[PDB]
């Protein structure tokens, strides 16, 4: 997901502006749905929501717009148990042997017969939560096992929290309501208001450990691999309690990253650290936010947002609709140089041509250079020390960059990766001069619609995830609900689309109407005022009631 909030110091009109570009599945229980909710006098909010939820998750109201991105904070901890040496169904806490709890669940299974049979399954639980096994990494042997404690299991505040956000007036009010309740489960929140404040909050539900506990409560080898793993044989490694937290064992709001500015804030699923580089966010728990190298989407965004030139709504829109493959900017120039150094290598001929004609985009019209580049990058990512200038923590926006072609061992390997990638692409069935739009589609009944965009890991801001299905790449997730909101005096001006359309049902008049529009990248008004709603020539109305 991407999010950009702009404030009075950088917006073309001196007011707030918000771009919301969440990347979520195109089917299933996380498929966004557009709606506008009004209780006249006290509630008036519009946006999109997830299935089954009677609240708006991402949206806007009269003076405020807000959105979310998945954060890098941990919302659970693994606990390594020390098993009782005499009994692998018991575990030690402070040297004392405790029994695992057993909860049995029974499931009905429909057989080939069409008859049901009952299946019983034992779920083992510790004081921390259920045990989990990852064969070859988190095993359950005679020495150790792993339990998982999920902080959001106790978060009964999540629905109240969005309903409260739905009633928020401005950014200050939004911040108060989120910090008070702490009901947001696992996302960042970014927002802008009419007055021109831009807000970033890393305000979610996060396991809390006092800082003095962390060096000895961590499992060093597992946290080095990115897992929030704690020592489960020490009672002192329980989540810390703090009276100010809304929920026992989670981090108080005051210890979570917040950035309130009037120029901009942004996030593309990296940590809080470089939300705005002019004001780095540092000094938080490793459970909360770390200073890790930022991905290419954020690196791209920052390269367009930095500076002193005003940001227009159009600027933010085109950051999405350009479909620029930002990863190419770090790799393609040196790659093209290697190509010129290896003309005559017939095996590289088709690839090098395609890469040279390529517009460096993931547009419908983009050439097969994108496909060659993707397969190369996948191999390039596995090479060691191939960057001409590796990540530099003192230049986090500009590194890594280039290919270390001056090192022979790198030059040989990069050329081999290009050869392998080229072979792989030509091995597949990609026709002569097929464009990216010919390949990446979304199926609607028995038709296909060409879909622009590409994988976010290659730095396409308009992130689109696809899987191979027969003769094409079928879109499974990515750019979904789009809203771009500004605040002219008349009222909120919102613009966007729901990429996969309102309905998942093929019978619906709204199964593919917005998808055709997404294909052509033609965003539309999101009508909010009664006057906007009444001006729509497609307006339909129905009133319904029934006794309680």
């Amino acid at each position: 997901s991407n999010a950009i909030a702009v404030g009075s110091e950088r917006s073309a009109d001196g007011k707030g502006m918000l771009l919301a570009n969440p990347h979520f599945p195109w089917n299933g229980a996380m498929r966004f749905y557009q709606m506008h909710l009004t209780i006249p006098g006290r509630l008036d909010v519009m946006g999109a929501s997830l299935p089954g939820l009677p609240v708006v998750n991402i949206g806007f109201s009269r003076h405020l717009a807000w959105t979310h991105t998945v954060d890098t904070s941990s919302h659970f901890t693994l606990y390594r148990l020390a098993l009782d040496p005499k009994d692998p169904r018991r575990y030690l806490v402070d040297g004392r042997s405790l029994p695992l709890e057993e909860k049995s669940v029974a499931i009905e299974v429909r057989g080939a017969d069409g008859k049901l049979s009952r299946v019983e399954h034992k779920v083992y639980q510790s004081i921390y939560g259920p045990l989990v096994v990852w064969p070859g990494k988190l095993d359950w042997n005679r020495s150790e096992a792993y339990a998982l404690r999920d902080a959001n299991l106790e978060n009964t505040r999540v629905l109240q929290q969005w309903y409260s956000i739905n009633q928020a007036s401005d950014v200050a009010d939004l911040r108060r309501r989120v910090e008070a309740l702490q009901g947001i489960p696992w996302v960042n929140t970014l927002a802008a208001d009419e007055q021109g404040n831009a807000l970033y909050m890393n305000q979610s539900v996060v396991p809390y450990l006092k800082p003095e506990l962390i060096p000895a409560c961590a499992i060093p080898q597992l946290v080095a691999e990115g897992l929030p793993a704690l020592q489960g044989q020490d009672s002192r490694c329980a989540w810390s309690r703090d009276p100010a937290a809304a929920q026992a064992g989670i981090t108080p709001a005051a210890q979570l990253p917040v950035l309130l500015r009037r120029d901009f804030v942004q996030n593309s699923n990296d940590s809080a650290w470089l939300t705005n580089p002019a004001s780095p966010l540092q000094g938080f728990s490793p459970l909360v936010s770390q200073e890790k190298p930022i991905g290419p989407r954020a690196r791209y965004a920052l390269s367009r947002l930095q500076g002193k030139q005003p940001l227009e709504a159009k600027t933010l829109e085109e950051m999405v609709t350009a479909n620029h493959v930002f990863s190419a900017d770090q790799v393609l120039p040196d790659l093209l140089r290697l190509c010129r150094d290896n003309q005559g290598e017939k095996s590289l001929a088709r690839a090098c041509a395609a890469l040279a004609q390529w517009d460096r985009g993931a547009n419908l019209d983009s050439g097969s250079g994108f496909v060659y580049f993707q397969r190369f990058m996948q191999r390039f990512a596995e090479l060691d020390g191939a960057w001409k200038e590796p990540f530099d923590a003192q230049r986090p926006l500009d590194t890594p960059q280039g290919i270390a072609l001056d090192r022979p061992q790198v030059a040989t390997q990069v050329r081999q990766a290009l050869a392998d990638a080229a072979a792989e692409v030509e091995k597949s069935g990609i026709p002569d001069g097929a464009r990216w739009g010919d390949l990446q589609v979304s199926t609607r009944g028995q038709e296909r619609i060409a879909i622009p965009g590409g994988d976010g890991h290659f730095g396409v801001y308009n992130a689109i995830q696809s899987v191979r299905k027969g003769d094409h790449l079928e879109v499974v997730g990515g750019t979904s609900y789009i809203q771009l909101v500004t605040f002219p005096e008349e009222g909120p001006k919102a613009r966007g689309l729901l990429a996969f359309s309102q309905s998942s049902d093929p019978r619906s008049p709204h199964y593919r109407d917005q998808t055709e529009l997404f294909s052509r990248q033609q965003w539309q008004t999101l009508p909010f005022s009664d006057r906007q709603i009444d001006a729509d020539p497609q307006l339909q109305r129905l009133s319904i009631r029934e006794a309680a």
Partner: protein, 164 residues
């Protein structure tokens, strides 16, 4: 005590729901969502109830690509009656009313549906929902940042035998 909503649809089937209270508001939301996505919601409620293997057998998967039986084990464990009850009792009146309204509105559309925008008309798993079903979906959503990512791992967790 009286559910009523006023719904307007603009271009692309975007609903604008107006009501005097949360119950009425929920009523309009559940009705309008059902018109577009009844089968989706029905399918995901089946998942969140741990009943996929019951309707579809062991060889299929959920829309999260988990095998039906491990998925069922996980959501039966996650959404036990006690957990749902404690969750409900911690909800504010306003949220309870939103949810009660949503269920009623979804169920109203089902009663009237003639297949115009519903492809799964007649399926045994397409049926009236309850507020508990919406709680099951909410809890399912909650744990996507946590134990939900380890659903297969939870199901696989069994103590060692006599191996060396």
């Amino acid at each position: 005590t009286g559910l009523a909503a006023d719904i307007r649809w603009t271009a692309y089937g975007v609903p604008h729901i107006r009501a005097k209270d949360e119950r009425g508001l929920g009523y309009g939301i559940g009705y309008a969502y059902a018109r577009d996505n009844a089968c989706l919601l029905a399918e995901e409620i089946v998942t969140a109830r741990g009943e996929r293997a019951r309707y579809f057998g062991s060889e299929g998967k959920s829309s999260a690509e988990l095998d039906n039986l491990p998925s069922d084990i996980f959501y039966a464990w996650l959404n036990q009656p006690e957990a749902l009850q404690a969750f409900w009792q911690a909800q504010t009146p306003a949220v309870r009313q939103l949810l009660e309204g949503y269920a009623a509105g979804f169920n109203r559309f089902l009663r009237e549906a003639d297949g115009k925008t519903t492809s799964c008309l007649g399926q045994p798993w397409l049926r009236a929902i309850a507020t508990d079903d919406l709680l099951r979906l909410t809890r399912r959503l909650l744990v996507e940042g946590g134990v939900g990512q380890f659903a297969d791992a939870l199901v696989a967790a069994a103590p060692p035998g006599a191996e060396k």
